[PDB]
Amino acid sequence: TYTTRQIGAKNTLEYKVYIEKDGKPVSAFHDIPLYADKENNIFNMVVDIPRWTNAKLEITKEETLNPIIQDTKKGKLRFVRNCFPHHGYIHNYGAFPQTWEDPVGDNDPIDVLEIGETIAYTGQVKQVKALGIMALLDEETDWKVIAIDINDPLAPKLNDIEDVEKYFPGLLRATNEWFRIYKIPDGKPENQFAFSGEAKNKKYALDIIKETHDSWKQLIAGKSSSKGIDLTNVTLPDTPTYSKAASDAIPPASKADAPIDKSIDKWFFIS
Amino acid sequence: TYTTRQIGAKNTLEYKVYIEKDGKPVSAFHDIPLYADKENNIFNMVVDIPRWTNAKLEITKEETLNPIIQDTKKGKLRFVRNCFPHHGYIHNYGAFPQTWEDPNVSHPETKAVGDNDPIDVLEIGETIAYTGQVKQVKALGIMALLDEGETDWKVIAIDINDPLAPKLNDIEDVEKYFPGLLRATNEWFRIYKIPDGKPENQFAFSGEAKNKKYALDIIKETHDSWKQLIAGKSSDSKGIDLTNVTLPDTPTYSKAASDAIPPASLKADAPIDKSIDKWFFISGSV
Ligand SMILES: [Mg+2]
Ligand SMILES: [Mg+2]
Ligand SMILES: [Mg+2]
Ligand SMILES: [Mg+2]
């Protein structure tokens, strides 16, 4: 059973979320299997960001057991701004564990947009099916897997990218727009997509996902060209960086959400 | 100074919010002056629903001192559903006090009777408001919604404290500083009850947002309707509670109605059913 352990108050520099297996902290990057069911390509997704929230939460590669923390720039917490007509993130946003875009590879687990009805929670491990994939150029190659929770009411009817057009008309357009503009309020440029923004299909997506799993397998085995990245894990006994003690060194669960500055409410008109 | 008195937990049937002056409840319908500053057309807006929320909190016309309570549909809490690409209400949503969309006459602009509520207000500023807030706003324009066939004007307004308020003086300025918002507003009020099983709404004037001058005229009309109502002179007051603590010349004035209200019993927000998360796609598929 996977649960979460929260350190500190949400929306602070101290906040961290660790994933627990049967009460014990594990690495969110290394210890969660990529596959929940390999034969049927059911993936475990680590969720970072609930739909319609702003705090830019991510698995941090450089801290032991790779907790989810809030991104910062020059000591300030990062919140993605509201870009009309969007509110915060328009997907449940997360990553596939045991993946790594080996760096042009973007130096992180592959990103996952989960499109189901239920709003997810930070540190949630859900099981998803891949429907397709888009290639954002952010600055670097930054694939976005389009996926759905297998528990979603619609999941049996969604198997490939054309089903997203059928059941979620306009979501692909919104996704294109969102990733193009979302850093414009921060004073960064518009992003660009390869393939004129087209979402490639499931088959194409599985190929890209497999590749990044293979890179991570070389990473965790200590055979990568890995500076900055903590490879401590507590479930892979034959890896150089296995250390069960790491799980025990994590502090106990901590607080109520800290307030978010009212500026984050603002709706920006840059569409 | 206006404050709130909360009874119970948000997102429950027991939740009530009374507006207080001097720490004592007043009628949110009748006792808050329409004008904060009549000479400069600055209005008091009672906020019901914060931007990007769902719970359909509204002034309760039939309850003494008209606290804000969550609407119910056949006994269950009513939450407005998320209609793609929108998240809940896309404005701070509330009402002008001391107004009424008169349900007893056909309004000539729409050829329909009024919806029986205070005139509705869409406050477009950056800061997300809170339920029971009384804020001061300027009117910028107005749209003529037919809500299930009833006259249901929507005033477009801005908090006077918004950083942009000095630059927003008429409806054209909304398109300049908030491009796309009026078009989204038209869509939102057309489609928002489709997930409830209701038909699409329609607007008069092909959804044009009429200007500030037009808005002031309609707001005046609704204030005049309310004056008749509160004086006990409506042909049909629809069982509206007319109890008030500030209008001595009205038949239902009662300063002590305030004393009878229970004290605050604020509890933490109750959880909302995960169904309310759902994003509804109403058309546009290839
Ligand atoms: Mg980043
Ligand atoms: Mg990436
Ligand atoms: Mg109603
Ligand atoms: Mg109305």
From Swiss-Prot, chain B:
SUPFAM superfamilies, sorted: Inorganic pyrophosphatase (SSF50324)
Keywords: Cytoplasm, Hydrolase, Isopeptide bond, Magnesium, Metal-binding, Phosphoprotein, Ubl conjugation
Location within or outside the cell: Cytoplasm
Cofactor: Mg(2+)
Manganese is among the record's keywords: no
Coiled coil: none
Modified residues (Phosphoserine): S265, S285
Note: Present with 68400 molecules/cell in log phase SD medium.
Oligomer and partners: Homodimer.
Protein name as annotated: Inorganic pyrophosphatase
